[PDB]
C-alpha cells in the first residue's frame with residue numbers, strides 16, 4: 001500500500017539548489033526549508049515502532065483542536081472584525097472540522113447554528129456574510145451556509161432544510177442575476193467575476209435541484225479557459241470580443257485549480273449536448289502532483305510554482321487530485337493502481353508541521369511560525385482526510401444510484417428567467433435530475449485503500465471530494481432536496 | 486473620546502437599526518463601539534437607500550475598519566455614481582488605502598470599476614502605478630490579475646499602442662532579471678508573448694522565444710518556472726522536443742549549458758527526455774526514465790512517475 005508513497009523520514013532532505021543564482025524567492029524558500037526540516041528533526045517519526053526518547057510526539061491532538069474550535073465558537077474578539085463579512089465561513093470551518101474530528105454537537109447548539117445561518121438568508125435569494133438586514137447575498141457565504149446546514153441541520157421544522165427548500169426559487173433567481181453572458185458569475189451585486197463563485201454556485205445548485213440549461217450556458221467555456229500553460233487554473237478568463245477567444249488572466253493557483261476542477265466535474269454530470277467543453281486533465285494532474293513539496297519542506301503542498309508550502313493546500317491541491325485522476329481515467333477509457341500523490345508525506349506534514357505545538361492553544365496552521373486559525377484547521381483536516389482515505393468516483397455505484405432513483409418524487413421545478421431557459425421537456429429534466437443526483441453520490445471509500453500514518457488513533461472521518469462535507473452528511477441532505485429519502 | 490452618532494446633530498433625523506442576529510447566535514464578534522455604531526447607522530442609511538455626502542463619508546469610515554466589507558463597497562460605488570463624484574479623486578483615495586495597508590479583493594475590484602467608468606484614453610499612468618505597487622510585493626496575485634485585466638480591457642478599445650506593448654515587455658524582462666524564479670512574471674511574459682490577441686507569433690519570433698527560455702534554463706537549471714514555460718511553449722505551438730534535446734541532455738546525466746550548486750539530474754530534464762522518447766515512439770526507453778524518476782531521482786512523486794511508466798508498459 002505504501003510502496004510508492006515513501007515517508008519524508010526515509011528520504012534525503014536537501015535544500016532547493018541555488019545554481020549560484022541567488023534571488024528573493026530562494027531566500028524565502030531556504031528560510032522556510034529551515035523552519036520545517038528543523039521541526040521534523042525535533043519530532044519522532046510517526047511510522048516508527050520504537051518512538052525515540054526525547055523527541056516530540058506527532059500524534060493528532062484531537063482534543064486540543066476541539067478546544068481551539070470551542071473557545072472561539074461562541075465568542076470572537078474585536079480583531080475578528082476583518083472577517084465580519086465571512087461569518088458563515090467561520091461556522092463552516094468549525095462544524096466541518098468537528099465532523100472530521102468525530103466530535104458531535106448537541107441539538108441545542110445545532111439549533112443555534114441553524115438559527116444564525118437562516119438570519120443570513122435574504123428573501124430575494126442567497127446568503128450573505130451576515131444578517132440579511134446588514135449584508136447583501138454573496139455566492140461564497142451561500143456555499144458556506146448551505147454546507148453548514150447539511151452538517152448541523154435536519155428535516156424537522158426547526159432544522160433549516162425546510163427553509164432552504166422554500167428558498168429554492170429565490171436562490172436560483174439570485175444565481176441568474178449573477179450570471180454574465182461569457183459564462184462567468186459575479187460573486188455579488190457589482191462584485192468580481194471568478195471561478196470561486198462558479199464552484200460555490202455549482203455545488204449549491206447541484207445540492208438543491210435548481211440546475212437549468214440557462215444557468216449553465218457558457219459556464220463550461222469560462223472554466224476551461226482558466227487553464228494556464230502550467231496545467232493548473234487561474235481565477236478568471238477574459239473574453240476577447242460570441243467571443244473570438246478566451247485568455248486566462250493570471251497564474252495557475254491551488255485554490256482556483258480546486259474550484260475549476262470541481263466545477264468541471266459537477267458539469268460532467270449534466271446531460272447537455274456537447275457539454276461540458278473539455279479541459280486538459282493530464283496537464284491538471286501533472287500540475288497538481290508537482291505542487292507537492294520536497295522532503296526538506298515536509299511534503300506539504302504549495303499553491304503556485306516557486307512559492308511556499310502551506311497546510312491549507314492539503315485540501316485545495318490535495319483534494320483536487322482524486323478529481324483530476326478520475327478525469328484522466330475517463331479520457332483514457334474514451335480512447336480504449338498506485339497513489340498519484342504521496343499520501344504518506346502529506347499526512348506527515350499535517351501531523352508534524354501543521355499542528356500547533358502541544359500543550360498550548362491547539363488548532364492547525366499554514367506552517368511553523370504561523371498562528372493557527374479556523375480556516376487552516378478546517379483545510380488541513382480536509383486534506384488529511386483525502387490523504388488518509390482512498391476516495392474514488394465509482395461507475396458501478398452511479399449505476400446502482402440510477403437503478404434506485406425515483407423520478408416521480410421531487411420538489412417543484414424552478415421557473416426559468418427566460419421562457420426557453422428551462423429543459424426541453426419533463427423527460428429530459430428527469431434524466432438530468434437522475435444524472436446530477438446519481439453522480440453526486442458516486443464517491444466511495446475504496447476497500448483496502450486506507451492509510452493512517454501513525455496508527456488508527458490518528459484516523460479522522462472521510463470527506464467527499466468536490467463537495468468537502470462528510471458522505472454521511474451529503475447523502476441525507478441531497479436525498480431530501482431530490483425527495484429520494 | 487468617541488462621540489456617539491446618536492449625539493451628533495448631523496445624524497439626529499436618522500434612527501439606527503440594530504443587527505438582526507436572532508437569538509443566541511454562533512460566532513458573534515465583539516464589535517468595537519465605533520464599528521457597531523457605524524453599522525447601526527449604515528443599516529439605517531442603506532434600508533432607506535439614502536444617496537448623500539454623509540452616507541459617502543460613513544462608507545469610508547466603515548471600510549477603513551473592515552476593508553473586506555463587500556456590502557459597504559457596493560454601496561460606496563452606488564454613492565459615487567449617484568452623486569456624480571470625482572472618480573479621479575476616489576482613485577487617489579485608493580492610493581492612500583494601499584499606503585495605509587488597507588487591502589483586499591474589494592479594493593482592487595473597486596479600482597477596476599473606477600477605471601472601467603473613467604475609461605481614460607491612455608491608461609499609462611494606471612499601468613505605472615501598478616508597476617510601482619508590484620516592486621515591493623512582486624508576487625501579489627490580485628495585482629497581477631488586475632494588470633492582465635487592464636491591458637486586456639483597454640486593448641479591446643484599441644488604446645494600447647505598439648510602443649506601450651514594447652515597454653511592457655521591457656518591464657517584464659527586468660522583473661525576470663531581478664528574480665528569474667518569479668512565476669508571476671513568467672505568467673505575464675506568456676500573456677505578452679503568446680496568449681494575447683496581438684502577440685507576435687512569426688517563425689523567427691518563436692525562434693527568439695526559444696532562445697530566451699533556454700538561456701533562462703541555463704542560467705537557473707533547477708527553476709521549475711522556466712521548465713513549465715518551455716513545456717507549455719512547445720505544446721502550444723506543436724513543436725517537436727527532439728531538435729531541442731541536445732540543449733537539455735546534459736541536465737539528465739540554440740543556447741547550450743555553460744554552474745556551481747547544480748546537482749544532476751534535474752527531475753524536469755528527465756521528464757523532457759522521457760517525453761522526447763514518447764515522441765520517437767520509443768515507449769520502453771520512456772518507461773525506463775519514468776522508473777528512474779519514481780525510484781531514484783524524484784521519489785516524492787514515486788506513484789505519479791510509476792503511473793506514467795505503466796502508461797508505456
Ligand SMILES: Cn1cnc(S(=O)(=O)N(CCN(Cc2cncn2C)c2ccc(C#N)cc2)Cc2ccccc2)c1
Pocket residue numbers: 086089140255310312366373374375376
Ligand atoms: C493565501 N490564501 C489561501 N487561500 C486564500 S482565500 O481563499 O482567498 N481566503 C483565505 C485568506 N486567509 C489568508 C491566508 C490563507 N492562507 C494563508 N494566508 C495568509 C485567511 C482567511 C481566514 C482565516 C481564519 N480564521 C485565516 C487566513 C480568503 C477567504 C476569507 C473568508 C472566507 C473565505 C475565503 C488566501
Ligand SMILES: CC(C)=CCC/C(C)=C/CC/C(C)=C/COP(=O)(O)OP(=O)(O)O
Pocket residue numbers: 140196199200253254255256259302303304307308310316624625626627
Ligand atoms: C470556495 C473558495 C472560497 C475557494 C478558495 C480558493 C482560494 C484558496 C484561492 C486563493 C486566493 C489567492 C489568490 C490568494 C493567494 O494569496 P497568497 O499570495 O498569500 O498565497 P500564496 O503565496 O500561497 O500564493
Ligand SMILES: OC[C@@H]1O[C@@](CO)(O[C@H]2O[C@H](CO)[C@@H](O)[C@@H](O)[C@@H]2O)[C@@H](O)[C@H]1O
Pocket residue numbers: 001002046047048049450451452453454455456
Ligand atoms: O497500511 C495499513 C495501516 O497500518 C496501520 C496499523 O494498523 O498503521 C501502520 O502503518 C502506517 C502507515 O504505513 C505507519 O504509520 C505505521 O506506524 C502503522 O503502524 C493502520 O494505521 C493502517 O493505516
Ligand SMILES: OC[C@@H]1O[C@@](CO)(O[C@H]2O[C@H](CO)[C@@H](O)[C@@H](O)[C@@H]2O)[C@@H](O)[C@H]1O
Pocket residue numbers: 124136189531532534559560561563564
Ligand atoms: O447600493 C445602492 C443600492 O443598490 C441597489 C441595486 O443596485 O439595491 C441593492 O442594495 C440594497 C441596499 O444595499 C439592498 O437592498 C440590495 O438587496 C439591493 O439589491 C439600489 O436599489 C441602490 O439603492
Ligand SMILES: OC[C@@H]1O[C@@](CO)(O[C@H]2O[C@H](CO)[C@@H](O)[C@@H](O)[C@@H]2O)[C@@H](O)[C@H]1O
Pocket residue numbers: 011012013014015016017294295296748749750781782783784
Ligand atoms: O543530489 C543528488 C540527488 O539527491 C536526491 C535524493 O537522493 O534528491 C534529493 O536532493 C535534491 C537536491 O538536489 C532535492 O530535490 C531533494 O528534495 C531530494 O531529496 C536524488 O534525487 C538525487 O538526484
Ligand SMILES: O=S(=O)(O)C[C@@H](O)CNC1CCCCC1
Pocket residue numbers: 060061062063064065359
Ligand atoms: O490528545 S490531545 O493532545 O488532544 C489531549 C491532551 O493533550 C490531554 N492530555 C492529558 C494531560 C493530563 C493527563 C491526562 C491526559
Ligand SMILES: O=S(=O)(O)C[C@@H](O)CNC1CCCCC1
Pocket residue numbers: 059454455456457458
Ligand atoms: O494503529 S493501532 O490501532 O494498531 C495502534 C494505535 O492506535 C496506537 N495509538 C497510540 C496509543 C497510545 C497513546 C498514543 C497513541
Ligand SMILES: O=S(=O)(O)C[C@H](O)CNC1CCCCC1
Pocket residue numbers: 122123124125132133134135136527528531532556
Ligand atoms: O432584498 S430583501 O428584500 O430580501 C432584504 C433587503 O433588501 C435588505 N437590505 C439590506 C439593507 C442594509 C444593508 C444590507 C442589505
Ligand SMILES: [Zn+2]
Pocket residue numbers: 310311312313366376
Ligand atoms: Zn494557507
